[PDB]
């Protein structure tokens, strides 16, 4: 039945809400260029040329493209995202279904500034998924090229490439090279279609909710503790003498009570204000940044371990690299003003999570004696301690869905730091390429590889369907909870809609944490 | 079997008359352009620019087109319409069948003023019906773009668009946006075809007939009533004194008899004459118009509640906005003379329905006493009273078939005011679009949505089939009834036929009310 | 729910109507002469298009502002109130038929008796200030429902002739007309759940 004049698929885009699950399917139109003139090319950056050692790399760029749907706005609409976040404590992806269909391959001819496009009915494309995870996995890096958030936008498939070991701009013996034609792939003409299914491994629900309590307040406010603490080490008066006095901490003093738990770990970061005059006058972006050091390279911790953006009544402050940052529609690449970016906020987790800018706490720096006054130092970075509890970073409508947990001997709490679901066997990479069609060869034999090809591109439709499991909200709270709401007041444009010129925009980040729970 | 070189449908156009039903099928050829360059765009009109507050709107225009057959001349020929109206008391649509087949998608190339059209065999179109009534329903608004009345005319598919809430030219929080690619739709190449069936919900027969009696004349003319009325309140003479005298109303005085019923409701309207000199010299069109006021906007009542166009022996008068108005073939859009329009006439319903221009009646304005002479005021607008009976507005060969009853807590007599059958679940909207085919992408990745497309349009055939139920005429009347007739006298052209230049015209409106019944 | 459309806007904004209306009754110029000109109403003129439906019924009521200085100086509460008269007794229509509280961009106005009024905790019985009451708002229904304070529309008061200029009167109260659609009054967390339909020969739309 595969043929020129019959479609190989239909347009399936919508969501369906059944009980404890939701199924969101979405269809897009794509265009695939020929990359690198059908060539593999090594790419590298050394220190020569004024570049920093931190930015050096070595790798390869491939003629292949790839499909990536790693952002939530691919699957969910803004209305569907509102149903999710207002009504549910949590969600996780159950399973996946992917399709390529209605494939056109077209050739381009140019002479005398005249440009002709025509169907090439016998050309093919090649598609394979990496099921065995045998290639460098580039999806969890939050790149561009995902399916658009708006279904009527036609998008371009991004080029595939990878990096490996280097010393400066040079390769090392361990650095590896991958030919993607060394994989079995399916070849498709206009009548052919492609499909596969995928099932997510078991993963904890993302927690969509805020706590209605904080660790330090878990106590009964009406009752004293039966335990004691050291209240006073000196007699009061003009000349005091040392003593040990003890008290039971009740509601009057809550800070001094005994507790079973500790706030989550921290790696401290620098505080930036949105009011400019409050910030230091200097360029502290890179220099005062919080960084980690790996094999002689320093790299920014972006965003880092999940920590509250700010404490009470300070919304102007945010950690320098410590929060996700989205651009408004039409924002440039480089040196864009604060007005075009959209900053997220993690403040919902300030119940269990230390604030990103502030210290974790203070510890004793010395041994005390009558000749030595006590000294207490500040803890800027704190690893895991027994008794810690913490919240993961929030997920956003336009943020990343999943990441691949690296394959390593050990890890700690392998939740991705940008957000989403850590996966040992994530959804596979889907690689696509236009098969090269050479122009006429010389008519006398030459061993050289053929460098002359017909210019071609391909278009088609891609459909992706995810089944999500929902965790219903059991709360017995009396008073009404905070919800995500559209503003009632009038405006020139509708939020999450096209404008006069026809372009779709997302006006703000939408997090998932609205409903509340008790610790 | 779907292929390039085999047709996916046949041309079915005709009617068949079986007993109490008739089945009218009709086939047309259509052409679908690309609208809005594959874009959604918001459209709005504010008060700025000299426009009135009444005309402000906010909405969106979509790349999609839509099929609409809401006019009777789509389904019926003039001969079939004559068989219907002369022989039947009533009719209603039973069920529907729709088809798209023989689809060509073509690409257009232009350079140096040379214009080339060619087949693109791998392109698709997208078609879906809105079965769940989840989109704004624009069909019942009597727009253009219906299937032509003449089967040999090729027609263009109208662009789809909708309006929502606004304040001036600005949107409000409740105003909603719809992406039509967020619906599952079927994609078709040249070999593919589309079909669906629909069944009309139970609806009362349209009444095609006139009454042979009037409410005020339902009595036996030969017999007196056994009841009484107040005939005379004063003695006759030079100086009269008050008294109460009573009479039985017989044939001599019919107006004073007791009656069981009342004429239908009215909303009064202004009287315009076709003889110009009789009309006031002023522009009273909008100012003296009958209007309703909704959220600060005034809108004309066009046509409004069904009322008789005129009373006996005045055919020159018609209510200003109170009747349907059709144009003659080739009439312009704006400020067209009376000669090019065709006015309908509702006078058949003057038996039960108050005349549109005249008052409903008179009621007492005060309490009477020997010091106060009675005062009686005129009732220009009258809502429903117990004991009213009325006729709906007539349907016309070129007029609208159905409308969607709005979804609301309540309605009263939900028959469409322009005419036809009110339907809670009317025939669904059928939306069609050319799938965008992009031109060659840049060969280096860019996140921007692709703005460069191949120019395409599509053509094909559309077939629609409706089964109509008939209500046969049981009348025992002796004398021959009025029929719809073609004029016997010679003419340059045949009515309802093409002329020398080849264009088809409908010379007059043809209503459905000819046969008669008793009240 | 609220409607995302209004009766007068149900049309396709991109397409003209195939019907006509009477656009102009007089020639333009210094001395005009009567004529009949007709136009097809498109997106440019939406108010003049033909429509299948009418707004719900109205019984007009008096407009009160929350800004005090805008209200008349007098006690118009009972005297200017909208009332019905039953066996010699006048009784306030409270709230009455469902009508929109206000039109666009006027939230300070409300119909006198035409909306439900709840008290804040601890409010007294008699002559309580505006601060202790909580007024509801029906504005969500202004799509299908005429505004409570404003007129329903205008109708012709006379027969026109070259000696008589047209006159058009205002309709303050309108009973049910064929083609009307309307919304019932909203329900509130603290408002009444049900009512008993009286036992009578007839009723119309027996929603409380």
What are the phi and psi torsion angles at A139 (to 5°)? Answer: -75, -35
Contact B2 A1 (CB under 8 A): yes
> Which B residues in the span 342-401 are in contact with C, Cβ-Cβ below 8 Å?
357-358, 380-386, 390, 392, 398
Rounded distance between C-alpha atoms, residue A124 and residue A432, angstroms: 11
Helix, strand, coil % in chain A, rounded to nearest 5? 5, 35, 60
| Residue-by-residue DSSP string for B133-146 | --S---GGG-BS-P
Mutate to test the interface with B, among C7, C16, C25, C187 (most CBs of B within 10 A): C25
Whole-number Cα distances in Å, A325 to A78, A302, A399, A477, C118: 19, 10, 10, 33, 45
CA dist list (Å): A398 to A155, A479, B448:
16, 31, 16
User: Which tokens go with C121?
Assistant: 């905790």
Distance from CA of A492 to the nearest CA of B (A): 5
Q: Can you tell me the distance from the alpha carbon of B389 to that of B411, in angstroms, rounded to the nearest whole number?
A: 17
- The partner residues of A517 in beta bridges, in order of sequence, read A211
**Pairing between β-strand B125-129 and β-strand B430-434 as defined by DSSP bridges:** antiparallel
Q: Count of CB atoms within 10 A of residue C130's CB?
A: 8
Asked if C155 and B415 come within 8 Å (Cβ–Cβ), the reply is no
Residue that has been written with the tokens 């809108």 in this structure: B299
Cα separation, C207 vs C47, in Å, equals 31
B-chain residue closest to C157, CA distance: B380
Of B84, B28, B87, nearest to B468 by C-alpha is B84
Cβ-based burial of A40 (10 A; exposed 0-12, middle 13-18, buried ≥19): middle
Nearest to A33 among B4, B172, B443 (CB): B443
Beta bridge partners of B167: B170
What stretch of H or E contains A75? helix A72-75
Determine, for residues B190 and A153 on separate chains, whether the beta-carbon distance falls below 8 Å: no
CA dihedral B355, B357, B363, B364 (to 10 degrees): -160
- Among A145, A193, A136, A138, smallest CA distance to A164 is for A136
How far lies B97's CA from each of A290, B8, B19, C104, in Å? Answer: 68, 16, 20, 44
Tell me, what DSSP letter sits at residue A87?
H
- For residue C173, which of C140, C146, C203 has the smallest C-alpha distance? C146
Binding site members of A for beta-D-galactose: 55
User: How far apart (Å, rounded) are the C-alpha atoms in residues B113 and A437?
Assistant: 32
Radius of gyration, CA atoms only, chain B: 28
Measured between beta carbons, the chain B residues lying within 8 angstroms of C152 are: 292-293
Query: Does an H or E element contain B75, and which?
Result: helix B72-75
If we measure between CA atoms, which residue out of A35, A139, A45, A33 comes closest to residue A96?
A139
DSSP-assigned letter for residue A82: H
Among B40, B109, B167, select the one facing A152 at the smallest CB separation: B40
Return the structure tokens found at A146.
């995902």
Instruction: Give the separation between CA A349 and CA A450, rounded to whole angstroms.
Output: 59
Binding residues of A: 55
Query: Which run of H or of E encompasses B86?
Result: helix B78-87
C23: left (phi over 0), alpha (psi -120 to 50) or beta: alpha
Going A436 to A442 to A445 to A449, the CA torsion angle's sign is negative
Give the three-state DSSP class for C170: strand
Q: What is the DSSP string of C12-69?
A: -TTS-BSB-EEEEEE--SSS--EEEEEE---SS--TTS--S-EEPPEE---EEESSGG
Interface list for A 136-195 with B (CB within 8 A): 144-145, 148, 150-156, 158-159, 190
The answer to whether B263 and B390 are in contact (CB under 8 A) is yes
Q: Which two tokens stand for residue A449?
A: 């590889």
- A491 and B171 within 8 Å at the Cβ level: the answer is yes
Chain A residue numbers with beta carbons less than 8 Å from the beta carbon of B111 are 114
In chain B, which residue's Cα lies nearest the Cα of C26? B283
Q: Does A31 touch chain B (CB under 8 A)?
A: yes
User: DSSP label at B340?
Assistant: T
Contacts of residue A130, defined as CB under 8 A and 6 or more positions apart, other chains included, come to A137, A183, A428, A429, A431
Structure token digits, residue A164? 């490996």
Cβ distance B291 to B278 under 8 Å? no
Q: Please give the Cα distance from A283 to A281 (Å, whole number).
A: 7
Rounded CA-CA distance B187/A13 in Å is 13
Residue carrying structure tokens 């078709």: B188
Contact B412 C179 (CB under 8 A): yes
Q: DSSP state, B153?
A: -
Q: How far apart are CA C39 and CA A368, in angstroms?
A: 98
A77/B121 Cβ within 8 A: no
Phi–psi pair at B78, nearest 5 degrees: -70, -30
Residues A76, A77, A78, CA angle at the centre, nearest 5°?
120
Nearest to A180 by CA among A160, A200, A196: A160
- Give me the total of CB pairs closer than 8 Å, taking one residue from chain A and one from chain B: 174
Contact C179 B138 (CB under 8 A): no
Asked if B380 lies within 8 A of C174 by C-beta distance, the reply is no
Residue B426 touches partner C, C-beta closer than 8 Å: no
Residue whose entry in the numeric block shows the structure tokens 């019923």: B261
CA atoms within 13 A on the CB side of A175: 18
Q: Which residues sit opposite A364 in a β-bridge?
A: A376
B68-83 in b/e form (b: 16+ CB < 10 A) is bbbbbbbbbbbebbbb
Could you tell me if B279 lies within 8 Å of chain C, comparing CB atoms? yes
CB B19 within 8 A of CB B264: no
* Displacement of CA B285 from its chain's centroid (Å): 22
Residues in chain A: 519
Extract the runs of DSSP E, i.e. beta strands, from B227-345. Answer: 229-234, 242-247, 262-263, 266-267, 271-273, 291-294, 297-300, 317-319, 325-327, 336-337, 341-343
Contact: A117, B440; criterion CB under 8 Å: yes
What residues in B contact C161, CB-CB < 8 Å?
A: 278-280
Chain C touched by B302 (CB under 8 Å): yes
Q: Which of B165, B269, B327 sits opposite C20 (nearest CB)?
A: B327
- E strand or H helix that includes residue A481: none
Q: Are strands B194-199 and B88-111 parallel, antiparallel or unpaired?
A: antiparallel
Q: Which of C9, C51, C178 sits opposite B163 (nearest CB)?
A: C9
Query: Which of 43-72 (B) contact C at CB < 8 A?
Result: 43, 45, 52, 54-55, 57, 59, 61, 71
Looking at chain B, which residue has its C-alpha nearest residue A501? Answer: B41
Longest dimension (CA), chain A: 110
Of B42, B126, B454, the CB nearest to A11: B126
Residues 6+ apart with CB under 8 A from B33: B65, B156, B157, B434, B457
List C residues 106-135 in contact with B (Cβ-Cβ < 8 A): none
B271–C160 C-beta distance less than 8 A: yes
Burial class (CB in 10 A: 0-12, 13-18, 19+), B358: buried
Q: Tokens at residue A295, please?
A: 């094999």
Interchain contact C10–B (C-beta under 8 A): yes
CA–CA distance from B47 to each of A171, B43, B51, B53, B167 (Å)?
68, 14, 5, 6, 10
Of the candidates A245, A240, A242, which has an alpha carbon nearest to the alpha carbon of residue A228?
A245
Instruction: Estimate the share of chain B in helix, then strand, then coil, as percent rounded to the nearest 5.
Output: 5, 35, 55
Closest residue by Cα to residue A393 from A262, A310, A303, A268? A303
Q: Which residue has the tokens 């596979």?
A: A428
Q: Name the 3-class secondary structure at B298.
A: strand
Per-residue CA distances from B27 to B70, B104, B137 (Å)? 15, 16, 24
Residue B83 is inside which H or E element, if any? helix B78-87
Strands C54-55 and C180-182: parallel
Q: What would the DSSP string read from start to end of B280-322?
A: -SS--TTTT--EEEETTEEEE-SS-S--BS--TT--SEEESSS
Q: Say whether C42 and B278 touch across the interface (CB within 8 A).
A: no
Instruction: Give the tokens for residue B177.
Output: 């946006």
State the Cα–Cα distance between residues B484 and B495, nearest whole angstrom. Answer: 13
Subunits with at least 3 CB pairs below 8 A relative to chain A? B
């Amino acid at each position: 039945a595969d043929g020129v004049g019959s479609s190989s698929g239909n347009w399936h885009c919508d969501s369906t809400w059944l009980g404890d699950r939701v199924i969101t399917t979405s269809t897009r139109t794509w265009a695939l260029p020929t990359y690198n003139n059908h060539l593999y090319k090594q790419i590298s950056n050394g220190t020569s040329g004024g570049s920093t050692n931190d930015n050096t790399y070595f790798g390869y760029s491939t003629p292949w493209g790839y499909f990536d749907f790693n952002r939530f706005h691919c699957h969910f609409s803004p209305r569907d995202w509102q149903r999710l976040i207002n009504n549910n404590w949590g969600f996780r992806p159950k399973r996946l279904n992917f399709k390529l269909f209605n494939i056109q391959v077209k050739e381009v001819t140019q002479n005398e500034g005249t440009k002709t496009i025509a169907n090439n009915l016998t050309s093919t494309i090649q598609v394979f998924t990496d099921s065995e995870y045998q290639l460098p996995y580039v999806l969890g890096s939050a790149h561009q090229g995902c399916l658009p958030p708006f279904p009527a936008d036609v998008f371009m498939i991004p080029q595939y490439g990878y990096l490996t070991l280097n010393n400066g701009a040079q390769a090392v013996g361990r650095s590896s090279f991958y030919c993607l034609e060394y994989f079995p792939s399916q070849m498709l003409r206009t009548g052919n279609n492609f499909e596969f299914s995928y099932q997510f491994e078991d993963v904890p629900f993302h927690s969509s909710y805020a706590h209605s309590q904080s660790l330090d307040r878990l106590m009964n406010p009406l009752i004293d503790q039966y335990l004691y603490y050291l209240s006073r080490t000196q007699t009061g008066g003009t000349a005091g003498t040392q003593q040990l006095l003890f008290s039971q901490a009740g509601p009057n003093n809550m800070s001094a009570q005994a507790k079973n738990w500790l706030p989550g770990p921290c790696y401290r970061q620098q505080r930036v204000s949105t009011t400019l005059s409050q910030n230091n006058n200097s360029n502290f972006a890179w220099t005062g940044a919080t960084k980690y050091h790996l094999n002689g390279r320093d790299s920014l911790v972006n965003p880092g371990v999940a920590m509250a953006t700010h404490k009470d009544d300070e919304e102007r402050f945010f950690p320098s690299s410590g929060v996700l940052m989205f651009g408004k529609q039409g924002a440039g690449k480089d040196n864009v003003d604060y007005s075009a970016v959209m900053l997220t906020s993690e403040e919902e987790i300030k119940t269990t999570n230390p604030v990103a800018t502030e210290q974790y706490g203070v510890v004793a720096d010395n041994l005390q004696q009558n000749s030595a006054q006590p000294i207490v130092g500040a803890v800027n970075s704190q690893g895991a301690l027994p008794g810690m509890v913490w919240q993961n970073r929030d997920v956003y409508l336009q943020g990343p869905i999943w990441a691949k947990i690296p394959h390593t001997d050990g890890n700690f709490h392998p939740s991705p730091l940008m957000g989403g679901f850590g996966l040992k066997h994530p959804p596979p990479q889907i690689l696509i390429k236009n098969t090269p069609v050479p122009a006429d060869p010389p008519t006398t034999f030459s061993q050289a590889k053929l460098a002359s090809f017909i210019t071609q591109y391909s278009t088609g439709q891609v459909s992706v369907e995810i089944e999500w499991e929902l965790q219903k909200e059991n709360s017995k709270r009396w008073n009404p909870e905070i919800q995500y709401t559209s503003n009632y007041y009038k405006s020139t444009n509708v939020d999450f809609a096209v404008n006069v010129d026809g372009t779709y925009s997302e006006p703000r980040p939408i997090g998932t944490r609205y409903l509340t729970r008790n610790l």
